[PDB]
Design an enzyme around this catalytic site. Structure first.
Site, short mmCIF file in Angstrom:
data_model
loop_
_atom_site.label_atom_id
_atom_site.label_comp_id
_atom_site.label_asym_id
_atom_site.label_seq_id
_atom_site.Cartn_x
_atom_site.Cartn_y
_atom_site.Cartn_z
N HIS A 187 0.81 -1.22 0.00
CA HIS A 187 0.00 0.00 0.00
C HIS A 187 0.84 1.27 0.00
CE1 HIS A 187 0.45 1.00 4.32
NE2 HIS A 187 -0.04 -0.17 4.69
N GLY B 266 3.12 5.56 10.23
CA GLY B 266 4.51 5.41 9.86
C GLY B 266 5.12 4.09 10.27
N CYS C 254 4.01 1.07 9.53
CA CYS C 254 3.87 0.00 8.54
C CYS C 254 5.22 -0.47 8.04
CB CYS C 254 3.01 0.48 7.38
SG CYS C 254 1.34 0.74 7.94
C1 LIG Z 1 1.22 2.49 8.16
O1 LIG Z 1 2.19 3.06 8.60
C2 LIG Z 1 -0.15 2.83 8.73
C3 LIG Z 1 -0.18 2.50 10.24
C4 LIG Z 1 -1.63 2.60 10.89
C5 LIG Z 1 -2.13 3.93 10.76
C6 LIG Z 1 -2.33 4.71 11.97
C7 LIG Z 1 -2.92 3.96 13.11
N1 LIG Z 1 -2.12 2.73 13.51
C8 LIG Z 1 -1.45 1.99 12.36
O2 LIG Z 1 -0.81 0.99 12.53
N2 LIG Z 1 -1.16 2.04 8.03
C9 LIG Z 1 -2.30 2.70 7.42
O3 LIG Z 1 -2.43 3.89 7.48
C10 LIG Z 1 -3.34 1.82 6.69
C11 LIG Z 1 -3.24 1.96 5.18
C12 LIG Z 1 -4.50 1.32 4.53
C13 LIG Z 1 -4.25 0.73 3.15
C14 LIG Z 1 -4.91 1.55 2.04
N3 LIG Z 1 -4.71 2.07 7.07
C15 LIG Z 1 -5.14 1.88 8.44
O4 LIG Z 1 -4.37 1.53 9.27
C16 LIG Z 1 -6.62 2.09 8.79
C17 LIG Z 1 -6.91 2.67 9.97
C18 LIG Z 1 -8.48 2.73 10.11
C19 LIG Z 1 -9.09 2.44 11.34
C20 LIG Z 1 -10.49 2.48 11.45
C21 LIG Z 1 -11.28 2.79 10.32
C22 LIG Z 1 -10.67 3.07 9.09
C23 LIG Z 1 -9.27 3.03 8.98
#
Ligand SMILES: *C(=O)[C@H](C[C@@H]1CCCNC1=O)NC(=O)[C@H](CCCC)NC(=O)/C=C/c1ccccc1
Ligand SMILES: *C(=O)[C@H](C[C@@H]1CCCNC1=O)NC(=O)[C@H](CCCC)NC(=O)/C=C/c1ccccc1
Lengths: 303, 303
Positions: B41, B143, B145
């Site tokens: 992603h 960040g 991920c």
């Molecule tokens: C990557 O670094 C990131 C880490 C997440 C984001 C912040 C919260 N804690 C984490 O581990 N991953 C994303 O941002 C990820 C990308 C989606 C692929 C298109 N999306 C999410 O983690 C979604 C969070 C969420 C929670 C509840 C409803 C909707 C979305």
């Protein structure tokens, strides 16, 4: 989101661990520049831990009595001295993996990471707090002596603990890296026991802020309290007094959550008086006191 | 003595972490030999996470769209491919710090260490379990991920988890290092939520053995139970069934303590029916299920 007991990455410290043998006793040493640091009780025999004159044992030792192994490379000891309850073994090779480092003594209530080691080889890493009674609740088996505790800031390792012994209650006692014990404990065989411990109040409040930051809010209330009436309740439940400096230190967490420190104190008073009645906070059914305000800020950065 | 949530030493994994940027998105990558692994992603824009055709975004990308930084040394991407939900970025330099490693997929109920990272730099290390519902209860900020989970045996790192996202309940979801998600989760924006979780029964029993090994004995009784009557009670309290293989796996802990598995099961049944009435076990007021039998044996070796 999420909140865990998190240790510092251990890589910089793993590169400093070696094995130290004297007589039939093997334990761990810390290799920084051309010095290896280890507990001085490595020179004791079991015939002499009642009342060892450590000085005595040491004048009777030579450099060749100390076998120092770094992985599978023996280091040659070219000098030895005592610094309080630690030995300094000068070796003929400076550790090429020596990080930037400091020797720091911590306060009761402060946290640090422990790299548990056996035979100079790291086994695991976990987070400890220095208890108010200067013990730590660790995980240490025979052979773990000389394992160290540390914090990292930037990429300077601040070493704060070297492991020496276990008390009858199963908690642990050790020194700073200058070899000065934390607490009223000695490296000789006595009936020594941990004195009365207390709960680290500022840390509990920090952890309640962590919970709010992570969406646990059920313990919150309107009420506020005075610092004086809070400390009256804390005293009753074996909690350390909360100072104005503690309040100030909690400032940033208070600002981020919009919950005044004395507002959160009213929540803590009610938790202390009522319990949780079956609920949990951040996965715990007890009030957690081994997270400092810094630990929370560092881990909960922006939710 | 002592029992802690202990992670593996993180040094071998710290040497593999790099930073990966595509567009305005930065996250972490895992650098092994001449390949960098990261969540696919990273190639998504916010205009296209509703229904990304990841294939589509990828054919539209070139090698120069990926900026890979190892400390302060940029690595040149010379190839890119997709492997399920992970990207493989071939780089022109093999990582000189590559440990012996394996890619392993773990089972619900198994534990592993997480090296939380931001901008390719490790921040902390902690122990997780794979929940029965294939989520993990971690500590992850934006960040993070591309941070990975792993176990070590001897000095081979078995990577088992790469972090991808957080669910609305605040738990976390990710893939194995072949890029196959744990659980029914997808790397696209949906209302996806964790399904119903259960308690890992064999792990709770392992932790009760840990407690006995460490001198916590108050929950023990004469009673024994049948496996059938135990599983009837477990079902009622949302506990996973205990199998004969679980009983066998607990063999060594049973032998060391002299407490038969079904004897300990009778203790657990009473804890489930009565609670602890104000007491604790290994510092916990709840029954802990994120220690495997191996975790206990490894940490409690000879008391
Ligand atoms: C990557 O670094 C990131 C880490 C997440 C984001 C912040 C919260 N804690 C984490 O581990 N991953 C994303 O941002 C990820 C990308 C989606 C692929 C298109 N999306 C999410 O983690 C979604 C969070 C969420 C929670 C509840 C409803 C909707 C979305
Ligand atoms: C060093 O490796 C070793 C580690 C200890 C021993 C096993 C239990 N857990 C540990 O961390 N340290 C010692 O063996 C130490 C040497 C004493 C200096 C002469 N002694 C102890 O730890 C004492 C244990 C004890 C407990 C209760 C009563 C008496 C002694």
């Amino acid at each position: 989101s999420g909140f865990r007991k998190m240790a510092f990455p251990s890589g910089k410290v793993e590169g400093c661990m070696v094995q130290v043998t004297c007589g039939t006793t093997t334990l761990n040493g810390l290799w920084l520049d051309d010095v290896v640091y280890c507990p001085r009780h490595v020179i004791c025999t079991s015939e002499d831990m009642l009342n060892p004159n450590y000085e005595d044992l040491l004048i009777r030792k030579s450099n060749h009595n100390f076998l120092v192994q770094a992985g599978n490379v023996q280091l040659r000891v070219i000098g030895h001295s005592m610094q309080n309850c630690v030995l300094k073994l000068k070796v003929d090779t400076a550790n090429p993996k020596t990080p930037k480092y400091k020797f720091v003594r911590i306060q009761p209530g402060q946290t640090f990471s422990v790299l548990a080691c056996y035979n100079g080889s790291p086994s695991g890493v976990y987070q400890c707090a220095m208890r108010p009674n200067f013990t730590i609740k660790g995980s240490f088996l025979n052979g773990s002596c000389g394992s160290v505790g540390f914090n990292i800031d930037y990429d300077c390792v601040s070493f704060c603990y070297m492991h020496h012994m276990e008390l009858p209650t199963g908690v642990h006692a050790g020194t700073d890296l200058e070899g000065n014990f934390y607490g009223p404990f000695v490296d000789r065989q006595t009936a020594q026991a941990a004195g009365t411990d207390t709960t680290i109040t500022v840390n509990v409040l920090a952890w309640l802020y962590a919970a709010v930051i992570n969406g646990d809010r059920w313990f919150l209330n309107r009420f506020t309290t005075t610092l004086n009436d809070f400390n009256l309740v804390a005293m009753k439940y074996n909690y350390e007094p909360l100072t104005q400096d503690h309040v100030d230190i909690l400032g940033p967490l208070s600002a981020q959550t919009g919950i005044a420190v004395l507002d959160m104190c009213a929540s803590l008073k009610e938790l202390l008086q009522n319990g949780m009645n079956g609920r949990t906070i951040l996965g715990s059914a007890l009030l957690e006191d081994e997270f400092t305000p810094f630990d929370v800020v560092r881990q909960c950065s922006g939710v």
